Write a structure and sequence with these properties.
part of a larger assembly; 6 chains; A mainly beta; B alpha/beta; C alpha/beta; D alpha+beta; E alpha+beta; F mainly alpha; C: alpha/beta; five-stranded parallel β-sheet; three-stranded antiparallel β-sheet; E: alpha+beta; Hypothetical Cytosolic Protein, Chain: A; two-stranded antiparallel sheet; about 20% helix; about 20% strand; binds magnesium ion; RNA-binding; structural constituent of ribosome (chain B)
RNA sequence: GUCACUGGAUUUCCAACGGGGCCUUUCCUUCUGGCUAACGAACCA
């Protein structure tokens, strides 16, 4: 305080800050890849997705929406990006 | 195939590169069928702080997405076939002047086609892979300026050695001055 | 400008952790955040003793270069810091003040406790604040033993210790006295520890 | 809603110098912030400054050395006849011998000493000292 | 402050604060000047020889006399690994 | 802050700093524009379209990867509606409120809010009238607009 | 030069300050004119 590097704040305090309050703003949301074991098909779902997602067929489920990150349903695998 | 892939009959280097292109067109599962549609307008030579010279190949615009699919391949074999040179692909972009009471033209003038959009497209082509993750501009206490370009961390190998080149590529073109940095 | 002999050394880092200086306050403060190393589970903050040490050295550096060693005033109104600052007064010139500072000491030339120090040292800025405040009226610099929660106002060059009590207050004054004797003075080869036991600075009571 | 955005800039600056800070984050940025900061730098009333690129309007971080008393904006931007510049400088500047009223003229953002030498005038912009 | 022919008027020129570079007024009585001793190799601070700083009352008032010493000392080569330019 | 209330809420999307990318997706825009027009003919708005695309299909944002914002697409293919979905919902709400005011005339808060809604609508329509998305008159009318939602 | 007024800069100091031209993707279009391309691509005033 009274002198500091604003151009290079630490990545520890830039991560705890609010979404819009980062030195340049950017999203905190990610995307997933998900399969249920019954189909080999891969479906890519958005972390906060508002739509209850199904894979290409079979209307199992994938996620259910909430006020936060969508809730992935039961046994499923999810990678990042 | 020698003089036709050129378009505007000169010059020395371009024909030299043209014969280095068709040479690579000999293999044709891919490396021919993909390389033939892509021609280029011309090239320029620019020195670097190191003894290696820079070879900048001008590209017609919308063809520019074809040289992108190859690129890594083509700049790999071009830096092989012409050693001691850095090979980069820049699209030739029309710049229309800022309209005024004196220089003025009908049909408005689009945003791309503006001097700043073009110089902001040069920085994007010079680096070609490794998307720019930010920027700054330093306004120096003596009155001059330095664009700090922030390059990605992925595949930054494809560039790392050419960074003092890109710099001098930009300075002979624009008149401006660059620096680079990486994420952490 | 600081030689590698001045570096921490394991012997000293032993005395500090044994004395438990490194244990810091639960409520931290905004000005004392740099001296924090990390927080323990169950809300106990670990002071960074290397920053503790180096400050101590810078502090002892400034006590030194004060031309007359009596002018330096060591103040504690706390009990824990009292027998501490008397000893600091005995080795270095250092006219001390233990317990009641009495107001109007640095102002009010007519008082009997009148002083005109060129430096002040303070164990607890909270409890001693009367001295810090008067100090701010006469242009007097101040050294401070500070916890994580301590008033930063009108204190230059703080030494984070523990200051909740026990041995830390005694150590930091002890180590303070030790280092101003090595600087200028006669101790001469800091390589060897001190004849004086650090338990000479401590609180007594029964 | 934001109106001037120059006036937000010179405010965060003038607020920071006074609190003893050495650096200030401005937002948003704009050509006129840039040019103002430029005439302030070139007389030494700030250090260097660095534009940040967010894809929208930009930010700036300016380094403050002290030595600056007030930097301020004049809204509205009044049309200033050429002889009136004398009259402006008398009101809002601490002495005849230093300080700068900074204009915006067909000859470009500058200070009144430059505009005096270039014999130009226009809308007034702000002051600095 | 120069005068007509190159000549020094203005009976005195004040000190400047090391942290803020703000003038230190004659009546500023919370202002402080710090004298840190200079050492020859292996201790033995040199008498009469100081690395000195001056802080303004504002800063000592504001609670920043501490962190501004650190930034200054490290800069002037007193301390190492204490003060941090990024947060 | 908020137009028609005191709320200062900043809750919003932060668009990433990217013109291009995600470097991973590479699904060939004409492939997404296809999926766009499908949901268009299915009777969806640009708003709920880009959500369905963002949730199930990846598709971070359609302005990126297709170079064109969603509504523009529907217009070039000719799925553009009469009144913007902006207006469409405001008038929807306003009509939905007025229906409630008919069976309850003693609800004053309802009478208050209808004013707020219709105020928003006349402001919006003026805009769309200025940039000529709507005819030089238009002018939402309380009685008539019930059929404009249905 | 009279022992504050006045005459000149030896292209060299150092310095600033301001004005006009060009070159760099760039002075648009039109009108008149000059010379020319195999009916008036070009170029120049
Ligand atoms: Mg405890
Ligand atoms: Mg200067
Ligand atoms: Mg707000
Ligand atoms: Mg309101
Ligand atoms: Mg209102």
């Amino acid at each position: 305080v009274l002198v500091q590097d604003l151009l290079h704040p630490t990545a520890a305090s830039e991560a705890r800050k609010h979404k819009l309050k980062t030195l340049v703003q950017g999203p905190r949301s990610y995307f997933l890849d998900v399969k249920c074991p019954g189909c080999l098909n891969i479906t890519t779902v958005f972390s906060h997705a508002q739509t209850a997602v199904t894979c290409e067929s079979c209307s199992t489920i994938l996620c259910t929406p909430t006020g936060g990150k969508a809730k992935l349903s039961e046994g499923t695998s999810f990678r990042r990006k | 195939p020698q003089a036709k892939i050129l378009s505007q009959a000169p010059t020395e280097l371009e024909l030299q590169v043209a014969q280095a292109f068709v040479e690579l067109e000999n293999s044709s599962p891919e490396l021919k069928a993909e390389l033939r549609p892509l021609q280029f307008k011309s090239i320029r030579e620019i020195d670097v702080a190191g003894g290696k010279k820079a070879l900048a190949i001008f590209v017609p615009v919308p063809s520019l997405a074809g040289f992108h699919k190859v690129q890594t391949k083509l700049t790999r074999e071009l830096e092989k076939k012409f050693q001691d040179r850095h090979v980069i692909f820049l699209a030739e972009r029309r710049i229309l002047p800022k309209p005024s009471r004196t220089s003025r033209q009908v049909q408005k003038r689009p945003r791309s086609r503006t001097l700043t959009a073009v110089h902001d497209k040069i920085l994007e082509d010079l680096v070609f892979p490794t998307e720019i993750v930010g920027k700054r501009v330093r306004y120096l206490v003596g009155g001059n300026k330095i664009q700090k370009v922030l390059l990605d961390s992925k595949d930054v190998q494809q560039i790392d050695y050419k960074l003092e080149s890109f710099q001098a590529v930009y300075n002979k073109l624009t008149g401006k001055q660059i620096v680079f940095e990486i994420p952490s | 400008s600081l030689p590698a002999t001045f570096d921490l050394t394991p012997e000293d880092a032993q005395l500090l952790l044994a004395a438990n200086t490194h244990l810091g306050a639960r409520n931290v403060q905004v000005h004392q955040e740099p001296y924090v190393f990390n927080a323990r589970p169950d809300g106990v903050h670990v002071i960074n003793v290397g920053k503790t040490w180096e400050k101590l050295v810078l502090a002892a550096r400034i006590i030194a270069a004060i031309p007359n060693p009596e002018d330096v005033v060591a103040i504690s109104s706390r009990t824990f810091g009292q027998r501490a600052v008397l000893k600091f007064a005995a080795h270095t010139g250092a006219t001390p003040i233990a317990g009641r500072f009495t107001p109007g000491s640095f102002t009010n030339y007519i008082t009997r406790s009148f002083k005109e120090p060129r430096l002040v040292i303070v164990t607890d800025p909270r409890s001693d604040a009367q001295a810090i405040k008067e100090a701010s009226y006469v242009n007097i610099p101040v050294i401070a033993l500070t916890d994580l929660d301590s008033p930063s106002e009108f204190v230059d060059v703080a030494i984070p210790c523990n200051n909740r009590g026990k041995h830390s207050i005694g150590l930091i004054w002890y180590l303070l006295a030790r280092e101003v004797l090595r600087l200028r003075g006669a101790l001469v080869d800091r390589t060897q520890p001190w004849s004086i036991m650090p338990d000479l600075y401590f609180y007594r009571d029964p | 809603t934001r109106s001037s955005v120059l006036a937000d800039a010179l405010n965060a600056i003038n607020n920071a110098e006074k609190t003893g800070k050495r650096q200030v984050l401005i937002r948003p940025s704009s050509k006129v912030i840039i040019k103002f900061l430029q005439v302030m730098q070139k007389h030494g009333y700030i250090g260097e400054f660095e534009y940040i690129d967010d894809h929208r309007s930009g930010k700036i971080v300016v380094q403050l050395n002290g030595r600056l008393n007030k930097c301020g904006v004049i809204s509205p931007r009044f049309n200033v006849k050429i002889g009136d510049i004398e009259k402006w400088t008398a009101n809002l500047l601490p002495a005849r011998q230093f300080g700068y009223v900074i204009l915006t003229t067909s000859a470009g953002i500058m200070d009144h000493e430059e505009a005096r030498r270039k014999h130009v005038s226009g809308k007034i912009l702000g002051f600095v000292y | 402050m120069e005068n007509d022919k190159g000549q020094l008027v203005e009976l005195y020129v004040p000190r400047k604060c090391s942290a803020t570079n703000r003038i230190i007024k004659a009546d500023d009585h919370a202002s402080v000047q710090i004298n840190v001793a200079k050492v020859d190799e292996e201790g033995r601070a040199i008498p009469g020889e100081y690395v000195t700083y001056a802080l303004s009352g504002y800063v000592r008032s504001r609670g920043e006399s501490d962190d501004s010493l650190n930034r200054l000392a490290q800069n002037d080569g007193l301390l190492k690994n204490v003060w941090s330019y990024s947060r | 802050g908020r137009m028609h209330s005191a709320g200062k809420g900043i809750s919003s999307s932060a668009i990433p700093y990217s013109r291009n990318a995600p470097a991973w997706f590479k699904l060939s825009s004409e492939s997404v524009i296809e999926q766009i027009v499908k949901y268009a003919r299915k009777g969806l708005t640009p708003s709920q379209i880009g959500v369905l695309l963002r949730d199930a299909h990846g598709v971070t944002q359609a302005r990126v990867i297709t170079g064109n914002k969603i509504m523009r697409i529907l217009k070039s293919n000719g799925l553009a509606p009469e009144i913007p979905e902006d207006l469409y919902y405001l008038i929807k709400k306003a009509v939905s409120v007025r229906k409630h005011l008919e069976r309850n005339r003693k609800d004053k808060d309802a009478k208050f809010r209808l004013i707020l809604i219709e105020s928003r609508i006349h402001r919006l329509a003026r805009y769309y009238r200025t940039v000529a998305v709507l005819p030089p008159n238009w002018k939402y009318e309380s009685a008539t607009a019930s059929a404009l939602v249905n």
